[PDB]
């Protein structure tokens, strides 16, 4: 078994496309800064803390 | 450095095989809807929220 | 869109290199047992539970 992480630009695309992305595939909604993992029948959003500066 | 996500069907397989999967490798137990990441000496289960419908 | 997980040995390397690693790329600081995901402008550390024994 194996998977990956799928990048997205808006919670738009990912919502009309979470249909394909097979089980156990992280789902990144970049503009929303949201990471969910594709589960059995729908998705389960993983908990992250507030952002840490980059510079 | 680089890794990936490893898919599984039951908390069975993943338990007798978490031995190989090297550090920093997410571990997905599909049937359990559990995502853990392989750490230094054992695994650290990542926190997810309750499932969001797919349809 | 697509990404991956990037492995590191110390919160050193990852701090001077979180600059490259593009959006939506998990970041693993192995020695710290920390998993963050690279977001819009800096990183957002994902929440994990305490470690589970491996043996």
Swiss-Prot record, chains A, B, C:
Q: Which domain of life is it from?
A: Eukaryota
Q: Report the PTM annotation.
A: Prolines at the third position of the tripeptide repeating unit (G-X-Y) of the triple-helical regions are hydroxylated.
Task: State the compartments where it is located.
Answer: Secreted, Extracellular space, Extracellular matrix; Secreted, Extracellular space, Extracellular matrix, Basement membrane
What does the record say about tissue specificity? Detected in placenta (at protein level). Present in multiple organs with highest levels in liver, lung and kidney.
Where are the stretches annotated Non-collagenous domain 1 association domain? 16-55
Function recorded in the entry: Probably plays a major role in determining the retinal structure as well as in the closure of the neural tube.
Q: Which disease is it linked to?
A: Knobloch syndrome 1: A developmental disorder primarily characterized by typical eye abnormalities, including high myopia, cataracts, dislocated lens, vitreoretinal degeneration, and retinal detachment, with occipital skull defects, which can range from occipital encephalocele to occult cutis aplasia.
What family is reported?
A: Belongs to the multiplexin collagen family.
Which named protein is this? Collagen alpha-1(XVIII) chain
Gene source species: Homo sapiens (Human)
């Amino acid at each position: 078994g194996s998977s990956g992480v799928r990048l997205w630009a808006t919670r738009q695309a990912m919502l009309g496309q979470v249909h394909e992305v097979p089980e156990g595939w992280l789902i990144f909604v970049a503009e929303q800064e949201e990471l969910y993992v594709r589960v059995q029948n729908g998705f389960r959003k993983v908990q992250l803390e507030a952002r840490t500066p980059l510079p």
